[PDB]
């Protein structure tokens, strides 16, 4: 999780973001932004954070867009 903490900066904020994204994927039904490769939502969310597509700001903006829609 070194890449994830490098991209985020704080371990606790990284845990919060990853947990929120994993809950969205498991319950809401959002599709994975990265290839699954037979991985659980936790590892998928961590990989998405490491790549740089999922952050707190991105999640907040996406939620705002959904609420507007």
């Amino acid at each position: 999780v070194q890449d994830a903490v490098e991209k985020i900066g704080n371990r606790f904020d990284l845990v919060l973001v990853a947990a929120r994204r994993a809950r969205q994927m498991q319950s809401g039904g959002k599709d994975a932004l990265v290839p699954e490769e037979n991985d659980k939502p936790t590892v998928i969310a961590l990989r998405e954070i490491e790549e740089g597509l999922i952050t707190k700001d991105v999640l907040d903006a996406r939620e705002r867009q959904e609420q507007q829609e």
């Binding site: 037979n38 991985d39 659980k40 936790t42 590892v43």
Partner: protein, 50 residues
């Protein structure tokens, strides 16, 4: 309960990416509880990395 064959494949799919916390008493410091990825083994003893 019947210990069917497919239950073991289901177990090896649940365990795949689910961490488990190992603890030893006394817990003198925070390294006394750690998360590991389980590998399923025959027998009744927990195998620990040296």
């Amino acid at each position: 309960e019947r210990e069917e064959a497919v239950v073991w494949d289901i177990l090896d799919e649940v365990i795949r990416e689910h961490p488990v916390l190992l603890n030893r008493a006394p817990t003198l410091h925070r390294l006394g509880i750690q998360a590991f990825e389980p590998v399923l083994i025959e027998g009744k003893a927990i195998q620990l990395h040296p």
